[PDB]
Amino acid sequence: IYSKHTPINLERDLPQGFSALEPLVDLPIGINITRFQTLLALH
Amino acid sequence: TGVLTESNKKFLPFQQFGRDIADTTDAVRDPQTLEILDITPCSFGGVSV
Numbered sequence: 001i002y003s004k005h006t007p008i009n010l011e012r013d014l015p016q017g018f019s020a021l022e023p024l025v026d027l028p029i030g031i032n033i034t035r036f037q038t039l040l041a042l043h
Numbered sequence: 044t045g046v047l048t049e050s051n052k053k054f055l056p057f058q059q060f061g062r063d064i065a066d067t068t069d070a071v072r073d074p075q076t077l078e079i080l081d082i083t084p085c086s087f088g089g090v091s092v
């Protein structure tokens with residue numbers, strides 16, 4: 001679950017630069033994953 | 044085998060070791076107290092007569 005937070009100027013697209021993604025948490029799960037989905041917080 | 048000295052290397056919190064280009068351990072982390080130690084080989088050289 002490599003992660004990185006970076007400041008941005010404006011919201012057009014991805015910037016130019018090298019932000020190295022430090023390891024954050026390793027998980028010992030070891031299950032079969034082929035598909036994924038992302039939730040949204042609806043009020 | 045070597046001399047364990049204090050180090051000023053800026054280890055990341057997920058990093059335990061530091062490696063030389065010959066794949067030998069240059070820095071180590073103490074498992075009891077979270078400190079970083081530099082390993083330097085002991086004094087050696089050649090003798091001519």
Ligand SMILES: *[C@@H]1O[C@H](CO)[C@@H](O)[C@H](O)[C@H]1NC(C)=O
Nearest residue numbers: 072073074075076077078079
């Ligand atoms: C092991 O040592 C560290 C540092 O001396 C200490 O913080 C930790 O609580 C110790 N663990 C146990 C189980 O006593």
